[PDB]
């Protein structure tokens, strides 16, 4: 089991479980779940109303001191009633640790902006709004960041087609760049790669 298998670290697992219990105890009002993965990553699932408190705690508590916001992003899962999942990755330099905070929202429910807690969030939230259409309340300047001016739709959503809806070309009659409905000389070839046999028995779901 030695050469080709990634080794385990039970000490970090125990420490992360203890700190997850600690955070859940201190903030019962917003914490809904705590997990530690098999590769020692701590995850905290919270109610959407606790974004500002929990993060503030994790930034300012003497035992947390998660001063750095490494990354903030969203995940689109259409089968869920709350379509969008907001993920915050935080780094603590004092204790040399990383934590993850996850909440949820849908297309119409705004999420409170965390610019006051972390300045770094300012662009990330913008990007989320650009790519998924999640509105952030009380954002100092919330606008598109990555897409073209006047772009309609949110590309990172699962129902958004890969090639989009419009394409650009220069037209000499009007002497300018114009947008037209997308047309492809070669259509993208969809591949069915999934095997009809189960791969991981440990992740099997109840058959209802």
């Amino acid at each position: 089991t030695r050469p080709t298998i990634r080794p385990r670290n039970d000490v970090v697992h125990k420490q992360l479980s203890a700190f997850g219990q600690y955070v859940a105890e201190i903030l019962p009002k917003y914490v809904q779940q705590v997990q530690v993965s098999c590769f020692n990553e701590l995850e905290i699932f919270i109610h959407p109303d606790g974004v500002i408190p929990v993060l503030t705690f994790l930034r300012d508590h003497t035992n947390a001191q998660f001063k750095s916001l490494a990354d903030l992003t969203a995940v689109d899962v259409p089968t869920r009633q709350n379509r969008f999942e907001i993920v915050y990755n935080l780094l603590s330099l004092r204790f040399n640790s990383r934590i993850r905070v996850k909440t949820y929202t849908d297309e119409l429910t705004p999420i409170e902006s965390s610019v006051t807690v972390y300045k770094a969030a300012n662009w990330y939230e913008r990007e989320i709004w650009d790519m998924f259409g999640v509105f952030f309340a009380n954002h100092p300047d919330l606008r598109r960041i990555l897409t073209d001016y006047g772009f309609e739709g949110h590309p990172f959503r699962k129902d958004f087609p890969l090639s989009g809806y419009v394409e650009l070309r220069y037209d000499d009659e009007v002497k300018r760049v114009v947008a037209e409905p997308v047309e492809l000389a070669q259509e993208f070839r969809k591949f069915d790669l999934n095997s009809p046999w189960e791969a991981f028995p440990a992740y099997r779901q109840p058959p209802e």
Binding site: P161, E183, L184, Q186, E187, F188
Partner: peptide, 28 residues
């Protein structure tokens, strides 16, 4: 007309979505 490839004009040709229950798909 060139190379004889397969051309399309609708963007939803390759869009396939996955759901756990039928009710979720209907709601979407």
């Amino acid at each position: 007309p060139l190379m004889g490839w397969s051309s399309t004009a609708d963007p939803l040709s390759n869009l396939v979505l996955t759901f756990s229950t039928k009710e979720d798909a209907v709601a979407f």
